[PDB]
């Protein structure tokens, strides 16, 4: 959290203040048919679009979308490396230290188990980096679900809008105030474009950015575990990840 | 500048004496408070999508468009370069005066000081190409905010227009107020495409074009560090790096 | 199946009881002209658009949507593998009986035969990689049919709509024959946008998803056979190939 | 010529497809509803680009009409093959091969340095960097015209909806609806005319002439590096004949 829900509440109150300054109800949005068309047609086109393996993992990514990343940041891996590498240099590489806590991931635990079992000069990268790339394709498999849903949901808004267009011209011209039958289609297109553009494409982009910083984090984990399977002299690891930190982080992490 | 603010005032006077000549006196977009939907909605859709390391740059790269690059354009670099590489051929590579008064621009010392220190004639090229591709990716992530704001802004403007049309049709739609209510509701999508397609997409485009010009300057500096690590004859540089400036000014470079 | 037909009947009932709650009750939905325009035009545009060798795969694709992919999901490859290395260790690679148990797999059997006839460690790699590359070329050629069908369907919706606008404007324009015609002659873009965006673009998407699932299955087959060729340790085959299935099934390795 | 005979055809197509159905031409003449479009796309393109508007907008608006009198591929074969035969006779000292080469400067920095410079892994890379820089400079102007083609119909949409706002609000005095609805009509007409018959095909013309220049300069690259070795000058006539089409390939038999 602290990134998603602030913008979520910001966008919902951005809807509500415009709905209350000139609009009337905010409860006339609660119609069964328009919500049926937009929500049910969106989720129907998505369950058509995806296999049953990749769509039982809807809430498993929907909770990682909201659960906080109190996990690893790039500057914090310099304490969470290079100190049991000191125990690897002056005492021995078999000094298992991250096996005790392993708060980070069951990823460098594989690194230490291969440091004591399946060590190599550079060959140990391939299992690790192909685990990273398989995870990357799994995150791309996960991120794509909102991309097509935001592709379909405003076109579902077109669908519900022209359904309400045909409904508007069914038994019309009664010379009274039943011209809010068109407004049901206006609620339909409002539902379509709001619940296709304000969340679905942003959460798609948020999964993409989380996956990008995730694979950067996994790549610096690769470099750290290949560092600890060399004894790479922790002042060397200072200027090593200088090409990983941005242009602002060149001096805040200089101590 | 001399292109951004001129184009801003061109577009605003275009809209202004378009609207006051076509028959609306600019107060139709002055009175509605439903233009919060664009201004808060774009911020919400950006803050869901983008990391906080790459947001809170929006003023500090909103102002970088107006700041013209009066720092090392190409045509004042061909006399500037092959001057340090010239003097190094008769003084030596240990001439550390080549960095201490070139230290005003910190990009150049990243190769120059590390080439006069370390014999890394391909490794300096490798890390400098890595740095300029990382800078291109960073400017792409920067301009991504403006591209995505240009995508969200007309969608959020018509998201205000649907609220206005529901407001226009729910209450009393059997009189000439229907024209005023729909029109002042239909100005929201005009706010969407005016404030939203003619600013945010061109400012995104100018971020991209200034990034292209900057990475052209940086590749010129890459050929500069590759030629200063060796020390060719200066005419050979003067036909090496010359192809990046326009050929109209290539014949003018004879004074 | 298990996701295709459930979603298809879900989308059809979404349209149906999102329309019969609002408006028309399929009366102005089966006037057999706009239906004829969109369907005959879509099939005509895809048979213009594609050659006769690729339009002779429309029923084959159109049922491989629905025929479920029950062939060796990754978690049951671990008992299927992890014993061939014991067969390649107790009696060596001279198991001529090894290629007869390959009862349901495309190129496991010939791959195992060209594995057991001679030591071909890089030869098997690029043969199977070219195999899966040509298969993904063929499945891209497959999914392109539904992709371009989804492109040409809503354009034909607009085409039938403007045919109907010509038919409705040049007609009795007193009170209702303008309106009844322009109501009936707008179902082209409804049934065109519905078939394009809710049927053939998720069908193209699902062909893409099943092709990617099958390609990941072929890659883990490649890594399995190039693990069991030289006789690796059968205890680290799970360390090699469990990465393609998630931690939800990696933690189900606790039986 | 092919740029001209299409532009005069497009303007006369607009003109006669109007005048056989339209009545006055005074609709789009001076409403200054084009002021949204004509000033709008030029405002958007001068926001969009960093001082390439007095420098390079009319400059390659001019090269959109320059018929390239450069040596096309079918006369490179009686140009490079006999030069490779000259290089087979005496060597790379053919200084009398470039003094008559009063042509583009892409040729001199490969021909004249052949007596005092290595060129195999050096001039191939220099010419490749030069044609990539040429491709970037023409990408700049192609980008200018693509962006004009993308901001022009949206400005037509924008002028249209200004006309819509002025239409149904400034209302009920019915002899005032000319420069609202006809303003919107001329606005969308300018948006889909100026931009779709003009700036997208101008962008495409710049891209296609740039790709002709790319293929021409790359076959010049293969020619000038064929001069460096003179690899049996009829053997040179297979590694470059694929660039000219198959129509004029069976013509090459003499």
């Amino acid at each position: 959290d602290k990134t998603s829900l602030i913008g979520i509440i910001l966008a919902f109150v951005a809807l509500s203040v415009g709905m209350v300054l000139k609009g009337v109800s905010f409860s006339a949005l609660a119609n069964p048919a328009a919500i049926l068309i937009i929500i049910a047609g969106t989720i129907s086109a998505v369950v058509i679009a995806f296999p049953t393996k990749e769509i039982k993992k809807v809430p498993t990514l929907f909770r990682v979308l909201f659960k906080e990343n109190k996990q690893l940041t790039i500057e914090e891996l310099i304490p969470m490396f290079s100190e049991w590498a000191q125990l690897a240099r002056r005492e021995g590489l078999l000094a298992l230290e991250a096996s005790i806590e392993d708060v980070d991931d069951a990823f460098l635990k594989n690194g230490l188990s291969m440091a004591v079992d399946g060590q190599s000069a550079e060959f140990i990268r391939d299992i690790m980096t192909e685990e990273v790339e398989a995870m990357e394709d799994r995150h791309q498999a996960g991120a794509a679900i909102f991309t097509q849903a935001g592709t379909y949901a405003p076109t579902l808004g077109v669908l519900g809008a022209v359904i309400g267009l045909i409904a508007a011209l069914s038994h019309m011209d009664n010379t009274d105030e039943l011209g809010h039958a068109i407004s049901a289609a206006f609620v339909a297109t409002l539902l379509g474009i709001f619940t296709g553009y304000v969340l679905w494409h942003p959460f798609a982009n948020k999964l993409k950015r989380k996956s990008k910083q995730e694979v950067k984090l996994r790549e610096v984990m690769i470099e750290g575990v290949l560092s600890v399977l060399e004894g790479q002299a922790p002042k060397v690891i200072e200027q090593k990840l200088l090409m990983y930190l941005p242009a602002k982080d060149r001096l805040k992490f200089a101590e | 500048d001399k292109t951004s603010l001129i184009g801003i005032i061109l577009a605003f006077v275009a809209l202004s004496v378009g609207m006051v000549l076509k028959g609306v006196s600019f107060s139709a977009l002055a009175n509605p408070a439903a233009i919060l939907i664009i201004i808060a909605g774009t911020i919400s859709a950006v803050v869901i999508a983008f990391p906080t390391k790459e947001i809170k740059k929006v003023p500090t790269l909103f102002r970088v468009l107006f700041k013209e690059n009066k720092q090392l354009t190409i045509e004042e670099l061909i006399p500037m370069f092959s001057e340090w590489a010239q003097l190094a051929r008769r003084e030596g590579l240990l001439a550390l005066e080549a960095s201490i008064e070139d230290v005003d621009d910190a990009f150049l010392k990243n190769g120059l000081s590390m080439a006069v220190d370390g014999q890394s004639a391909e490794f300096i090229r490798d890390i400098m190409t890595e740095e300029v591709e990382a800078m291109e990716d960073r400017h792409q992530a920067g301009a991504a905010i403006f591209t995505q704001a240009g995508t969200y802004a007309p969608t959020l403007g018509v998201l205000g227009a649907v609220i206005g049309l529901i407001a226009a049709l729910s209450h009393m739609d059997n009189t000439d107020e229907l024209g005023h209510a729909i029109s002042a509701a239909f100005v929201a999508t005009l706010l969407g495409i005016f404030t939203g397609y003619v600013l945010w997409h061109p400012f995104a485009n100018k971020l991209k074009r200034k990034s292209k010009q900057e990475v052209k300057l940086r590749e010129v500096m890459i050929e500069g560090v590759l030629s200063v690590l060796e020390g060719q004859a200066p005419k050979v540089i003067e036909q090496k790096l010359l192809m990046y400036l326009p050929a109209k000014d290539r014949l003018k470079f004879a004074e | 199946d298990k996701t295709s037909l459930i979603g298809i009947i879900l989308a059809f009932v979404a349209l149906s009881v999102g329309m019969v709650l609002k408006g028309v009750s399929f009366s102005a939905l089966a006037n057999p002209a706009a239906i004829l325009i969109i369907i005959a035009g879509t099939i005509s545009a895809v048979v213009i658009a594609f050659p006769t060798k690729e339009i002779k795969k429309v029923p084959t694709l159109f049922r491989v949507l629905f025929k479920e992919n029950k062939q060796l999901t990754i978690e049951e490859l671990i008992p299927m593998f992890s014993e061939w290395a014991q067969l390649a260790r107790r009696e060596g690679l001279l198991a001529l009986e090894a290629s007869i148990e390959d009862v349901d797999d495309a190129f496991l059997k010939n791959g195992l035969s060209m594995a057991v006839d001679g030591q071909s460690a890089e030869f098997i790699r690029d043969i199977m990689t070219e195999e899966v590359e040509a298969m993904e070329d063929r499945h891209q050629a497959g999914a392109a049919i539904f992709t371009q069908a989804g492109t040409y369907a809503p354009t034909l919706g607009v085409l039938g709509a403007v045919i109907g606008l010509i038919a409705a404007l040049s007609h009795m324009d007193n009170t209702d024959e303008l309106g009844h015609a322009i109501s009936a002659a707008f179902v082209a873009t409804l049934l065109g946008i519905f078939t394009g965006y809710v049927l053939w673009h998720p069908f193209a998407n699902k062909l893409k998803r099943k092709s990617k699932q099958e390609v990941k299955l072929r890659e883990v087959m490649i890594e399995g056979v190039l693990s069991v060729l030289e006789g690796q340790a059968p205890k680290v085959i799970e360390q090699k190939l469990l990465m393609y299935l998630p931690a939800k099934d990696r933690l189900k390795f606790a039986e | 010529k092919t740029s001209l005979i299409g532009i005069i055809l497009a303007f006369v197509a607009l003109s006669v497809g109007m005048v056989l159905k339209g009545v006055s031409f005074s609709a789009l003449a001076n409403p200054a509803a084009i002021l949204i479009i004509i000033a709008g796309t030029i405002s958007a393109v001068v926001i969009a680009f960093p001082t390439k508007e007095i420098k390079k907008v009319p400059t390659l608006f001019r090269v959109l009409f320059k018929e390239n009198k450069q040596l096309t591929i079918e006369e490179l074969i009686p140009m490079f093959s006999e030069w490779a035969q000259l290089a087979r006779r005496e060597g790379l000292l053919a200084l009398e091969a470039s003094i008559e080469d009063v042509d583009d400067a892409f040729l001199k920095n490969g021909l004249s340095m052949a007596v005092d410079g290595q060129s195999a892994e050096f001039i191939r890379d220099i010419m490749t960097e030069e044609v990539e820089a040429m491709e970037d400079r023409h990408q700049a102007g192609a980008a200018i015209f693509t962006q004009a083609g993308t901001y022009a119909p949206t400005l037509g949409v924008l002028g249209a909806v200004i006309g819509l706002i002025a239409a149904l609000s400034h209302m009920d005095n019915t002899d005032e609806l000319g420069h609202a609805i006809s303003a919107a009509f001329v606005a969308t007409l300018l948006g889909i005319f100026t931009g779709y018959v003009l700036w997208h095909p101008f962008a495409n013309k710049l891209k296609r002439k740039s790709k002709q220049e790319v293929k021409l300069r790359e076959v010049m690259i293969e020619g000038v590096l064929s001069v460096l070795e003179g690899q049996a000058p009829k053997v040179i006539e297979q590694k470059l004949l694929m660039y000219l089409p198959a129509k004029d390939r069976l013509k090459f038999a003499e």
């Binding site: - | 995508t151 227009a161 | 322009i182 | -």
Partner: peptide, 26 residues
Amino acid sequence: VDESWLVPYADILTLLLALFIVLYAS
């Protein structure tokens, strides 16, 4: 060149279109 927003704009045009169609009754 995304141009992925004409989808709501065409919808409000269809809707206000049919609105002024059904108001066009005399």
